[PDB]
Amino acid sequence: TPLEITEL
Amino acid sequence: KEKKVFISLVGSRGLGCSISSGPIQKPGIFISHVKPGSLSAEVGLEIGDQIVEVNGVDFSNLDHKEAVNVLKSSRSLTISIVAAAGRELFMT
C-alpha cells in the first residue's frame, strides 16, 4: 500500500 | 550526492513541498509533490528527494511526524537533502 504523505 | 537546501519564509506562504515516509528497508523523510512559485520550487525540490537533515537534526531515521513538526515549528530552517535518497524507494 502507498506510503503516508504530508503537505508542507 | 548530498544536496543543501535553505527554506526561509520571507513572505507569508509555506515552502510548497510535501513529504512521505519510506518502507522498512530504508525508513526516512521523503519529498512529495511540490507547488510552483513556492520556496520548494525555488530551492529545487521535487518528488524522489530525501531530507537527511533539518537545522542540525539528522533526518536519517527521523520519524514522519517529527519531520513535519520541526518543519512546522520553524518557518525558516536549513534542510539538507540528498538526491536519490528517496527516488530509490519511489521506484516500486
UniProtKB/Swiss-Prot annotation, chain A:
Three calcium ions are usually bound at the interface of each cadherin domain and rigidify the connections, imparting a strong curvature to the full-length ectodomain. Cadherin repeats 1 and 2 mediate calcium-dependent heterophilic interaction with PCDH15. Cadherins are calcium-dependent cell adhesion proteins. They preferentially interact with themselves in a homophilic manner in connecting cells. CDH23 is required for establishing and/or maintaining the proper organization of the stereocilia bundle of hair cells in the cochlea and the vestibule during late embryonic/early postnatal development. It is part of the functional network formed by USH1C, USH1G, CDH23 and MYO7A that mediates mechanotransduction in cochlear hair cells. Required for normal hearing. antiparallel heterodimer with PCDH15. Interacts with USH1C and USH1G. This is Cadherin-23. It comes from Homo sapiens. Particularly strong expression in the retina. Found also in the cochlea. It comes from the Eukaryota. It is linked to Usher syndrome 1D: USH is a genetically heterogeneous condition characterized by the association of retinitis pigmentosa with sensorineural deafness. Age at onset and differences in auditory and vestibular function distinguish Usher syndrome type 1 (USH1), Usher syndrome type 2 (USH2) and Usher syndrome type 3 (USH3). USH1 is characterized by profound congenital sensorineural deafness, absent vestibular function and prepubertal onset of progressive retinitis pigmentosa leading to blindness. The chain holds residues 3347 to 3354 of 3354 of the full protein. It is found in: Cell membrane.
UniProtKB/Swiss-Prot annotation, chain B:
It is found in: Cytoplasm, Cytosol; Cytoplasm, Cytoskeleton; Cell projection, Microvillus. Residues 4-86 form the PDZ domain. The modification Phosphoserine is found at S12. Expressed in small intestine, colon, kidney, eye and weakly in pancreas. Expressed also in vestibule of the inner ear. The PDZ 1 domain mediates interaction with ANKS4B, DOCK4, USHBP1, USH1G, SLC4A7. The N-terminal region constitutes an independently folded domain that has structural similarity with the CCM2 C-terminus, despite very low sequence similarity. Anchoring/scaffolding protein that is a part of the functional network formed by USH1C, USH1G, CDH23 and MYO7A that mediates mechanotransduction in cochlear hair cells. Required for normal development and maintenance of cochlear hair cell bundles. As part of the intermicrovillar adhesion complex/IMAC plays a role in brush border differentiation, controlling microvilli organization and length. Probably plays a central regulatory role in the assembly of the complex, recruiting CDHR2, CDHR5 and MYO7B to the microvilli tips. It is linked to Usher syndrome 1C: USH is a genetically heterogeneous condition characterized by the association of retinitis pigmentosa with sensorineural deafness. Age at onset and differences in auditory and vestibular function distinguish Usher syndrome type 1 (USH1), Usher syndrome type 2 (USH2) and Usher syndrome type 3 (USH3). USH1 is characterized by profound congenital sensorineural deafness, absent vestibular function and prepubertal onset of progressive retinitis pigmentosa leading to blindness. Part of the IMAC/intermicrovillar adhesion complex/intermicrovillar tip-link complex composed of ANKS4B, MYO7B, USH1C, CDHR2 and CDHR5. Part of a complex composed of USH1C, USH1G and MYO7A. Interacts with F-actin. Interacts with USH2A. Interacts with SLC4A7. Interacts (via PDZ1 domain) with the C-terminus of USHBP1. Interacts (via N-terminus and PDZ 2 domain) with CDH23. Interacts with USH1G. Interacts with MYO7B. Interacts with CDHR2 and CDHR5; may mediate their interaction with MYO7B at the microvilli tip. Interacts (via PDZ 1 domain) with ANKS4B. Interacts (via PDZ 1 domain) with DOCK4. This is Harmonin. It comes from Homo sapiens. The chain holds residues 208 to 299 of 552 of the full protein.
